[PDB]
Amino acid sequence: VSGSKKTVVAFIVMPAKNNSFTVEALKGQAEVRALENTVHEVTTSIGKRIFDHAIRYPHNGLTTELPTDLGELLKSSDKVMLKRRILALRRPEGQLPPIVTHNMVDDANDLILNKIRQVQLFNSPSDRVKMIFHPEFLNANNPILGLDYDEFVRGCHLGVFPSYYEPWGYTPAECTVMGVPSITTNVSGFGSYMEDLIETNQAKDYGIYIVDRRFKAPDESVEQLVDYMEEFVKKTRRQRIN
Amino acid sequence: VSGSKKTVVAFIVMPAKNNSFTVEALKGQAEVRALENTVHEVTTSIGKRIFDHAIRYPHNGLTTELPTDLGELLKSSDKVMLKRRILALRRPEGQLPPIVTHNMVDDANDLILNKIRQVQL
Amino acid sequence: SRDLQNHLLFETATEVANRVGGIYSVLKSKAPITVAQYKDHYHLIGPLNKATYQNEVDILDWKKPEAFSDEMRPVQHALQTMESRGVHFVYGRWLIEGAPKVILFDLDSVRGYSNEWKGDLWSLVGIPSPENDFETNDAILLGYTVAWFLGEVAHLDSQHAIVAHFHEWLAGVALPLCRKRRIDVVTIFTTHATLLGRYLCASGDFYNCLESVDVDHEAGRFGIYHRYCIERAAAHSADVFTTVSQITAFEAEHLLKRKPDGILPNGLNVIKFQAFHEFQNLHALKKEKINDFVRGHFHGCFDFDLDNTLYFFIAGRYEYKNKGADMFIEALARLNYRLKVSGSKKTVVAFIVMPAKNNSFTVEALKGQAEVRALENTVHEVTTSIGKRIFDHAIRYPHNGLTTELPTDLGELLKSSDKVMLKRRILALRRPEGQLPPIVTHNMVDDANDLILNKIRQVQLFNSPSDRVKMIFHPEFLNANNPILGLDYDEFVRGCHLGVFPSYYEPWGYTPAECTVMGVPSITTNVSGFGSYMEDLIETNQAKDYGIYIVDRRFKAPDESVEQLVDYMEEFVKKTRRQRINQRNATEALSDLLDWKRMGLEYVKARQLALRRGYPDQFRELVGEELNDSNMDALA
Ligand SMILES: O=P(O)(O)OC[C@H]1O[C@H](O)[C@H](O)[C@@H](O)[C@@H]1O
C-alpha cells in the first residue's frame, strides 16, 4: 500500500517431523555455487587482459590507458559458460520460491504451513514479505545454511517472539545479548521484566518492542505487532546500527 | 631486415664484481607487482557485478543475460586506481631498459659491458 | 537603501584557482557550505594563473543572457564594463565540489596601468614598491583591478548589499582603496598569518618579547616594509578584521596594531561514514600495511611483537625548528630511556615524514621488502600442501590405521622439501653480523648535513634491539604508488596510533586537524592555531581524554616543554587496547567541531558584523534595535 522499496525475509526456525532437506534446496545452493566459481574463472581471464593492456600502454596502438570496450575483456567462451550457469538457475514456468526447506512428514496437517497457505504468502515477486520455514534446529554442519543458532541470530535484523505463554523469554534475552532488537509480549517473563526495568516508552529506543497481549483483544494485538514491524522497516541503516 | 615480429631476449649469466642489484631493477619489479595487485582488486569488484547481473536476470529491467557495457562493470574509482599504477610504470622520457641488473664495481672497464656498448645493443 | 537580507558576497585571494598554500585548500573546502547558502549570489575573485587555470576551471560563456539571473545582471554589466576598457578575464566555475562561480583577472592585460597605480598607491596610502618585487607588483595590479570591478558592481546594483571578503595581504590592496573611494560595499579582511610574525620566528624568544617590538623597524630590518604596509593597510581599511586562530589574533594585535573582531578557524569538508565504527575498521586494515613495511625494514632483526607496538609520526614541510622535529626527536630519546628504565614491554616505532633532497629508496629498503614477500609466497605454498594432507587424514579417518581424527605429529604435514625452502627463505632475511635496521629509507643527497639525521645520530637512536623506541626517517611525501610503504597519506595516518606535531609558528594546525578528523589522537602546542583553538573549547586535562595533547610552548622553558611532551607520550604508551579504542572514538566524535557545517557559522558572524557596521541603521530597523558592535561575539 505504501509502495515501500524494502523487502522482509522472515524465518521460522521450529523443529517439526521431517524427512530432511528437499533436493530443490540443496540443488539451488549448488547451482549458485557453480555460478560463483564460473565467475571467478572469468574474472581471472579478464584480469590478465586488463594487466596486459596496462603494462603495454601506450605501445602497439593502445591509445587509452585502459580498455574501453567490454569486448576486449569478455570473450565468447566466457559468455557461453556464464549463460549455461544462468540457465541452470532458471526455474519452471510459474514456479515460485518454496515456503519450506525440508520435506515434511505430514505436510497437509502442519499448523505452520497451513497458516502460511491461509494468509497466502507464497513468495511472489509482488510480495514485499518473503516466508521461509526451516523446521529444524540450526547448525554449522547443515548443507544449506551453515550457521550455528547464535551466528544466525547475529546476522538477522529483528527477533519476533509474540509469545502467549512464556514464564521466561530465553530467546528474546539471548537475542538481546547479541545486540539484536526484538519483539516480545507483556505476558512473557522477559517482556514483563523489561517492562519494569526500562522507562515505559524508552524500550523501543533500546530495541525492545513489547506487544500488549494482556489488556487487548487479539486483533488489537496483531495490529500493534504490525505497527512495530512497520516502524522498524522504516528505519535507515544508520538508525538500525545505532 | 626480414620484418620478423619475434623478439630475442639474451641473458648473460657470468659472475663479476658487483655492488648488488640496482635500485631500478628492484623498483620496476615492485611497481609491476603493485599493478598486478590492483588488477586483482578491480576484477574482484567486477566479479561481484557480473554475479549480481547473472543472479537477477531477467528481473529489474535486465534485458540481457550478461552485462554489455563495460561501464556497468568498471567504476571510476577502479579507473583512478589503475591509471595510477600505470603512471608509476612510466620511465623518464628517452630512458631505455638497462643492459645490466647490478651496480658494477668497475663498470667502465668491464669486458662484457664494453662489448655491448660497442655493438650498441 | 540596500537589502541586508538578500545580499551579495565576493571572496578574493591569490589562491583562487592556483594551489600555492593552505589558503587554496581553505577556500576549496569551504565552497560547498557557502555555495549552499548563496547559490549564485557568491563569487570568487583571483589572478588568472594562465599556466594552470585550464585544468582547474570550467571556462564558461559569460556572454549569454542565460549566464546570469535577472537580479544578477549587475555583475554581467560590470563585466562588460571591464570588457570595454580592454580588461581580459576568465569566467566559469571551479572544477571542485560546490562549483562556485569564479572570476579570474588576467593581470597582463592591465600591467600598463602599473606605473600610474604604483604612484597613486604610494601617494594615497604611503606604500612604496621596489621594481624587483614581482609579488607586490602583481598584488597592486590585482588590488586595483578588483576595486575597479567592485566599484562598478556597487554602481550597477541597487538592491543587494555587497560583502567583499579578502584573504591575506597579497589580496588586501583593494581594501585601502574601497575605504578611500567610499565605495558602497562592506569589507572583511582575514589574515592567515602575519608578515612580521613569520620573519621574527624565522631565526631563533618571540611569543614573549613581541608585545614590545617596533613594527616599523623590523619591517625595514627584514626588507619587508612595503609588504608590511599593505598588510597593515588592508588590516585597517576593512570593516571587519579577523584571523584564523586566537594565537594569531594575539600577534596581529601587537604587530598590525588592531585587535581582531573575531576568529575564523579553518574547517574541513569532513566525509562521514554511514557506520560510525567504520573508521575503526579502516585503522585496523591500514595498520596491517604499516605492519608489512615494518617486517621488511626490521628483517633479520625482528625481536618485538607488532600486537604490542605503537606507531607515532610527525609530518609536514621540512622545517626542523618550526615544526618541532628537534623536540620530537629529543623527546623520543628521553621516552626511550624511560621505557627501558621502567621495564616496559611495549615498542614504539616513530616515523618522520618530511620531504628532503634524496636519490630515492635504498637498495636495502627494496631488497628487504622483496625477501619478505618471497617468504610469504613460500609459506603460502607450504600451507596448501599442509592443507591437502590434513584434508586427506580427515576424510579418511578412521580407516587405514588412522586412530586419531586429526594429525598429531608435525612430520605428517611438514615434509623435508617444505623445510628446505622455508629455511632458504629465512637465510635470505638474515643480515650481516652487527648490522642494524636503518634510520632512513632513502639515499640522501646530503646525508652528513641533514638536520633530522644529525639530531637522530646525536641522541643515538640507532634501532638497537635494546631500544624500545625505533626511528624511521622517510624523506618523501607518502604516496600509494610507492614501492615500500604503499599508502597515501590519509591511509597512513589512519593506520597510526598517535600524531606528534610540536610546532612553534603555526597560525593554523592543518596537520593535527586532519589527524583528528581521521580519528587519530595527536600532540599539538598552545602556540599552534589548532592548539589554541582546542584549549578554548575543552579544559586542557579533559582534552587528553579526547585524544588532544596540548604542549605548552608559550610559558614553559624549552626543556620544560620537552619533558611535558615526553610525559604525554609515556602516558599514551601506557594505555591498553581498550583505552586506545575508546580514546579514538572520542577524538573521532570531536571531528564534527572541525567541520565546515559548524566552523562555517563564524564566516556568517563575520559577514553580519560587517553588515551591522556598514549600515547600522537598516540593521537597527531589520532587527528592531542595535546590538553591541565591538566583537563578532558581542553581536551574537
Ligand atoms: O591498533 P590498536 O590501538 O591496538 O587497535 C586495534 C583495534 O583496532 C580496531 O578497533 C579494530 O576494529 C579492532 O579489531 C582492533 O583490535
Curated annotation (Swiss-Prot), chain B:
Post-translational modification: Phosphorylated by the cyclin-CDK PCL10-PHO85. Phosphorylation causes inactivation of enzyme.
Domain of life: Eukaryota
Subcellular location as annotated: Cytoplasm, Cytosol
Subunit structure: Interacts with PCL10.
Residues with PTM Phosphoserine: 20
Phylogenetic classification of the source organism: Eukaryota, Fungi, Dikarya, Ascomycota, Saccharomycotina
Natural source organism: Saccharomyces cerevisiae (strain ATCC 204508 / S288c) (Baker's yeast)
Known role: Glycogen synthase participates in the glycogen biosynthetic process along with glycogenin and glycogen branching enzyme. Extends the primer composed of a few glucose units formed by glycogenin by adding new glucose units to it. In this context, glycogen synthase transfers the glycosyl residue from UDP-Glc to the non-reducing end of alpha-1,4-glucan.
Assigned protein family: Belongs to the glycosyltransferase 3 family.
Protein name per UniProt: Glycogen [starch] synthase isoform 2
Additional detail: Present with 14600 molecules/cell in log phase SD medium.
